[PDB]
Design a binder for this molecule. Structure first.
Ligand SMILES: [Ca+2]
Ligand SMILES: [Ca+2]
Ligand code: NA
Ligand code: NA
Lengths: 248, 240
DNA sequence: GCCGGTCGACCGGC
DNA sequence: GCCGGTCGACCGGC
């Protein structure tokens, strides 16, 4: 991780920062991006921003198939790329812009190594309902692709929780946490199938004791995933069929 | 519904107005149905304000109809904690956007907003699992003429330094063919559609719709459980 | 403590 | 045309 080395400063800075009032605390992310962008200038990109720079540097390379080749990495291609037509139609006059379903909020990129940062915001005033972290399914395809191409040192996926409470008509950050997906026990991750099949946790609560190799992590995760996937299918009969069979 | 009769009016005013549109819709209705229109939470304030006597949740829940209870109430603690100086507010999780109730009949109205110049990705309509519960309760409690769940679609476009409304539509969940509704299991078990494509045939009885919807739910729940195997198990066993 | 459902609407593969 | 996956958090039942 590129941001750990200065997490303490980020931590300190953000704590205190405020925001207007009507993803309620989403703009807390605009700040993280600003700070990153002030102290890691050359490494910090919004995902679309990253794609935009990528295609601007190779304006001769038009059309999606050829543009996709620019990643040199099927996995990163998978995690960062826009759709075919979207890539087909990209141009300097017609840049990529934000997209709800993009994987990362922020990319930190040095020496062709990638840290995908995602910022989970949170109202500590309100209940403590753990938020969607990332699609379990998307993460599964990610692992598959990691083995298939033997890309185990390409990239990490990390999280920065930013806690806040309401004060008057201003939202103020009271605390923050930071964690690394691939340093957690794969098998302990909670998959909420109904909740868009999303791993769910709070960053402060996430363990980091994992040992093995990145490759061992993918394998282990795929085990977990498949296992929970078999249980969920069965759970469905008990929860969504049995209770309603009688009205029929 | 209390909405359909004046759908000409609604329509007329909406087009040209410049994606928080649930606001505008609401306005017109308040200005025209003063004593029928509530935000789901406003209704709840009122129902609790007009009964200062009874307090606590058990009692308060008695004020609503296990089916309206289920669909509209805010849950034990929130309810127990309600008071004049501590009123309910907007909650993302609420079933309805707008309520319109006359003579103890309820119109749960849901405004679906749609970026008309982007893509036709049908949005979440209502959890198919919540619906299933409802249908079950309607039957168990033999209450088939109490409420409707209608939708008003509101299409919009960024033609300007603002977002403009280009068109609208209106449909009734319970005039739709059940077995036809799409249940997107991963997307929060949500029924997904555009209000404008929603079939409005169905010439059966509210009861029939329910036992038909439930059969659809169950059948679709069975497909999904199988699909999970094919999609999330078979393709990854080779790695484990 | 443990667990998992709900809103909101939004592309893109073939 | 036909399908369905994703991001965003966020509550309440026992
Ligand atoms: Ca985020
Ligand atoms: Ca709505
Ligand atoms: Na994510
Ligand atoms: Na709904």
């Amino acid at each position: 991780s590129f941001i750990k080395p200065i997490y303490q400063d980020i931590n300190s800075i953000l704590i205190g920062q405020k925001v207007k009032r009507p993803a309620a605390g989403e703009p807390f992310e605009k700040l993280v991006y600003k700070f990153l962008k002030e102290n890691l200038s050359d490494l910090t990109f919004k995902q679309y921003e990253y794609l935009n720079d990528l295609f601007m540097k190779n304006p001769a390379i038009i059309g999606h198939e050829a543009r996709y080749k620019l990643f040199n990495s099927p996995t990163l291609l998978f995690l960062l790329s826009r759709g075919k037509a979207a890539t087909e139609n990209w141009s300097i006059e017609n840049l990529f812009e934000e997209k709800q379903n993009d994987t990362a909020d922020i990319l930190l990129v040095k020496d062709q190594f990638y840290e995908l940062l995602d910022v989970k915001t949170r109202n500590i005033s309100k209940s403590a309902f753990a938020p969607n972290i990332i699609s379990a399914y998307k993460l599964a395809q990610t692992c598959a692709k990691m083995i298939d191409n033997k890309e185990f040192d390409l990239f990490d996926i990390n999280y920065l929780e930013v806690d806040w409470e309401l004060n008057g008509e201003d939202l103020v950050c009271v605390s923050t946490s930071f964690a690394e997906l691939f340093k957690s026990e794969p098998s302990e991750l909670y998959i909420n199938w109904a909740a868009a099949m999303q791993i769910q946790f709070h960053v402060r609560d996430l363990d980091q004791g994992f040992n093995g190799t990145r490759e061992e992590w993918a394998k282990s995760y795929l085990k977990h995933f498949v296992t929970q996937a078999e249980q969920r299918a069965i759970s469905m009969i008990d929860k969504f069929v049995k209770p309603f069979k009688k009205y029929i």
